[PDB]
Design a protein around this nucleic acid. Structure first.
Lengths: 117, 184, 186, 50, 83, 50, 130
RNA sequence: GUUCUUUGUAAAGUGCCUUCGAAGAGUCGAGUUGUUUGGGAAUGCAGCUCUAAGUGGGUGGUUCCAUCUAAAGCUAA
RNA sequence: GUUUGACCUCAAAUCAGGUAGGAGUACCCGCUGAACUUAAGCAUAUCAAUAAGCGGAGGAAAAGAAACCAACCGGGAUUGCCUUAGUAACGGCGAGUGAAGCGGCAAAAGCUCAAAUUUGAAAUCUGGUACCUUCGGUGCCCGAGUUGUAAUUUGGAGAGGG
């Protein structure tokens, strides 16, 4: 596969180390600006499609509205506490829903919220 | 000789409109209310001109001054907003509907007379949107209607509606006849 | 709201009333210059649903464009709507092009109405819902095919049907036709 | 020109009659403001011969 | 197991929103008929749906829309011929 | 029958809230001294311009 | 380059800037308690672990409470206008506990407030007044 | 961290009960001609004849079923 | 009314103030666009949706929160890297062209209008003037707007009340 001018565009990843260092510095800056809160939002536990991988359990974008309601809070208030909320993900597994509810309940207990003022 | 391009275009537009055949939905205007009944309707409407910016500001300032030192009835005025008028119509809330015959977008108001007829609300067409605008402190409104007339003028409004029925709805009940604009 | 009635009426373009309206309007625009400003939009509902507002700063323009394209068989896929938007933007470079809508057409020429917003007017600059258009990155949206017609021409849409140009055909071609080499060869 | 193409199309059984129906300064614009066949174009060009 | 979590936009396919139906009927009455709808009704007056369906199919891209157009034309004719 | 029910709101049977808002805003502005009451404005047409 | 060659040859000098060192040592600026306990010598993850705060919620890639008491301690460490108060005074002195009668009082109850709202306002007035 | 103001019968947050229930047209789509993609399912676009409905429409799949609501717009890494 | 005035359209000011050309151009967004070369000589093909040319932007740009992907115990903005893969697929299966779901990681932010009457008060805003605690704020005035500016709202519903 060398019928083109590929020699004009030969991207060599010499920067790997510098890019990793820059990513670490960006993470440190985010922590400095987001010190009290975690760097990443609490993602749910979800099951994968593509049965070749359905046996695997992996994270997801955010909890569904039903999961948030069952967790004892609201979607609008959940976002401010860093809980990821998905308005398009429908719940179709009772076992996964129970695990998500338990995870949300544990997260609510582990979090401490400072006064709004 | 020569004349301005815009003048020539507008003059030719009149000839085209006169000579061109229009569908029954169009030309429903220009079959307007007679001069006398339209004048009476405008006289009645003038008694209910909505409060203008200056008058409203004066009233609010007077109220503020009175409050600073230490229960009026519901205001009455004509409803003229096209969106507001259309929302009032089809709800059986309007008693009299006025429609301008010179709306620049014709399609904007073709359905309003037919919609009023379907809803049974009395309606009339008057010449000139400028006349409608003048009585509502606006440049143009293209429509005008009454919703809550005072008891003193309730009989006058009822008589005006009854007269307008015969004057316009009965005289022009055949407006759907052969296409207009058939002039040599 | 009367806008629903206007939208429904505009759908029956083949109707006799709309046919006569188009016949009158095409001649009215054919007497005027190729590009001429419009005092008010002829389709208030379409403009309103396209972001039009009856406030100082918004301008409505009308432009005429020739129709048609084996010497003449060359496609030159430049769309008529895109050409009209580019022409009105060039004539109104100080303005910004938001979108355009079909209003009329003729056997020899097409007619489109375009909505423009002046970023210099304080009303737009002080409006939170419209101050975004004043960003320099939004300069000459039509010139880069950022309008609805431009985006449609570029084929930028979700799904497998637009994989070739899901994020720009040139960008995808450059990314795919590039040899990737790491420090530690795989 | 298109009249000759329509006549040629009607000559053969591709289409028939049923398919067919299935101011001076203003008339001038009206007069001045469909697919065609190469065979019909050649036929009309030949017919134009004096 | 099944959970039937909650409805979506696809569940908003409810009634015709009679206000919208009234608006559509008013527009149809005021707007009139298109040049092909005129031919359709003219053939229905004497030829019935036989030719009208074929004309609609030729004008439209599929017969599913042609049958709906024929039904709409018949509904309009029924009211017009008596009301 | 009307095309839709649309239950009426309380704002169509109660004095306008926006009118009260502007009244109170004008009261506050006058209290702050940046708005001369109409009485003083009228009096200035006789206590001044002499 | 063209411009660069002239700039070096020119006597205008250069806008020398040195901030590479400052790009790494970034002082925490979103909390006083953490700042007084944060250690710039250790990494962000190490500092979070020492303080006890969870740096990451998801499982990190690759293998890896006095301060918390201070955070918890942080948890432990509006009257009606004159016109409204006067209106409530009139309502109380003219009707009293007759909420149903007050609801139908066209004169005083220009705003057709519900019985619940009226009694809620009256309770606050009683709490704040005699 | 310290301090001046608020306010006005003003704006929002959850549960329950009562009454209602607006979504983008020369647009989707069809045939023609050109171009382009691995896209054989005709992949997208453009010029042209015609012109769609709201218990509707688009994209897929074993008698039907699975998923979204285009034809308006903004957005930091 | 043999008149005067309302509008609608169209004119000119060295009217008051703003906006545009152009330059740079590695990267970005569109239009236009070949050949040498490679093949079974060759029109399909490859060179190439490249070279050059034109127009429009910034530190990044585009795209971006599905009329998506999938057929599962289903995933849930876009973008970037390994893999999927030199597989599916295309190509006189001829040289050759050639993807995408899923899987592992970086980053993760959602949203704003149209369409239901503020209708018990166009409550919206530009501009001119006098002041001030001048990246703007207040009073006053002409105007833009009712052919729709304020508030709420986008199915994640939503709206009128208790």
């Amino acid at each position: 596969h060398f019928r083109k001018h590929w020699q004009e565009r030969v991207k060599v990843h010499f920067d790997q180390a510098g890019k990793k260092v820059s990513r670490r510095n960006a993470r440190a800056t985010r922590a400095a600006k987001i010190a009290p809160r975690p760097l990443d939002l609490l993602r749910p536990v979800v099951r994968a499609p593509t049965v070749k991988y359905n046996r695997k359990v992996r994270a997801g974008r955010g909890f569904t509205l039903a999961e948030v309601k069952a967790a004892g809070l609201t979607a609008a208030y959940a976002r401010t506490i860093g809980i990821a909320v998905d308005h398009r993900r429908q719940n179709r597994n009772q076992e996964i829903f129970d695990a998500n509810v338990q995870r949300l309940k544990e997260y609510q207990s582990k979090i401490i919220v400072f006064p709004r003022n | 000789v020569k004349w301005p391009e815009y003048v020539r275009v507008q003059r030719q537009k009149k000839i085209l409109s006169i000579r061109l055949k229009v569908p029954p939905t169009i030309a429903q205007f220009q079959y307007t209310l007679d001069r006398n009944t339209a004048a009476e309707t405008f006289k009645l409407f003038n008694k209910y001109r909505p409060e203008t910016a200056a008058e409203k500001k004066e009233r609010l300032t007077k109220e503020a001054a009175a409050v600073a030192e230490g229960a009026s009835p519901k205001p009455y005025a004509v409803k003229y907003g096209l969106n507001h008028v259309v929302a009032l119509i089809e709800n059986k809330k309007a008693k009299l509907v006025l429609i301008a015959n010179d709306v620049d977008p014709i399609e904007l108001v073709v359905f309003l007379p037919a919609l009023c007829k379907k809803m049974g609300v009395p309606y009339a067409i008057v010449k000139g949107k400028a006349r409608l605008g003048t009585l509502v402190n606006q440049k143009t409104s293209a429509v005008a209607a009454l919703t809550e007339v005072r008891a003193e003028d309730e009989a006058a409004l009822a008589k005006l509606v009854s007269t307008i029925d015969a004057n316009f709805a009965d005289k022009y009940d055949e407006v759907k006849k052969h296409w207009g604009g058939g002039i040599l | 709201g009367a806008y629903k009635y206007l939208e429904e009426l505009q759908r029956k373009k083949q109707s006799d009333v709309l046919r006569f309206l188009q016949r009158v309007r095409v001649w009215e625009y054919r007497q005027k210059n190729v590009i001429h400003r419009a005092a008010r939009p002829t389709r208030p509902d379409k403009a309103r649903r396209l972001g039009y507002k009856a406030k100082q700063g918004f301008v409505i323009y009308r432009v005429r464009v020739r129709r048609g394209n084996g010497v003449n068989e060359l496609k030159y896929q430049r769309s008529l709507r895109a050409t009209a938007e580019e022409r009105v933007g060039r004539r109104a470079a100080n303005l910004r092009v938001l979108n355009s809508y079909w209003v009329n057409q003729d056997s020899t020429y097409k007619y489109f109405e375009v909505i423009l917003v002046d970023p210099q007017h304080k009303a737009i600059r002080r409006d939170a819902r419209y101050n975004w258009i004043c960003d320099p990155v939004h300069k000459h949206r039509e010139a880069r095919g950022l309008t609805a017609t431009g985006k449609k021409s570029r084929g930028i849409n979700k799904g497998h049907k637009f994989n070739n140009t899901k994020a720009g055909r040139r960008k995808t071609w450059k990314r795919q036709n590039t040899l990737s080499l790491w420090r530690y060869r795989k | 020109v298109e009249a000759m193409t329509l006549a040629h199309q009607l000559a053969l059984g591709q289409k028939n009659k049923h398919d067919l129906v299935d101011p001076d300064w203003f008339l001038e614009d009206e007069k001045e403001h469909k697919p065609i066949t190469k065979e019909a174009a050649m036929a009309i060009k030949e017919k134009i011969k004096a | 197991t099944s959970m039937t979590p909650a409805p979506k936009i696809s569940y908003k396919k409810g009634a015709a929103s009679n206000r919208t139906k009234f608006v559509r009927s008013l527009v149809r009455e005021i707007a009139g008929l298109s040049p092909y709808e005129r031919r359709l009704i003219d053939l229905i007056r004497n030829s019935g749906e036989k030719r009208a369906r074929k004309v609609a199919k030729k004008r439209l891209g599929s017969f599913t829309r042609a049958k709906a157009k024929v039904e709409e034309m018949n509904n309009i004719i029924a009211a017009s011929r008596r009301h | 029958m009307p095309l839709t029910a649309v239950p009426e709101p309380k704002r169509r049977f109660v004095p306008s809230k926006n009118e009260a808002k502007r009244v109170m805003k004008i009261v506050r502005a006058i209290r702050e001294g940046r708005i001369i009451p109409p009485k003083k404005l009228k009096e200035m047409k006789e206590k001044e311009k002499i | 380059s063209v411009r660069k060659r002239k700039m070096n040859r020119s006597s205008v000098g250069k806008a020398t800037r040195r901030n590479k060192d400052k790009q790494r040592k970034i002082n925490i600026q979103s909390n006083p308690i953490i700042a007084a306990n944060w250690d710039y010598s250790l990494t962000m993850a190490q500092n979070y672990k020492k303080l006890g705060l969870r740096a990451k919620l998801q499982t990190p890639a690759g293998g890896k409470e006095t301060e918390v008491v201070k955070k918890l301690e942080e948890l432990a460490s509006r009257s009606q206008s004159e016109r409204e108060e006067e209106w409530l005074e009139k309502l109380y002195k003219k009707h009293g506990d007759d909420y149903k009668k007050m609801f139908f009082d066209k004169k005083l109850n220009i705003y057709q407030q519900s019985e619940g709202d009226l009694k809620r306002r009256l309770l606050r007035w009683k709490k704040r007044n005699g």
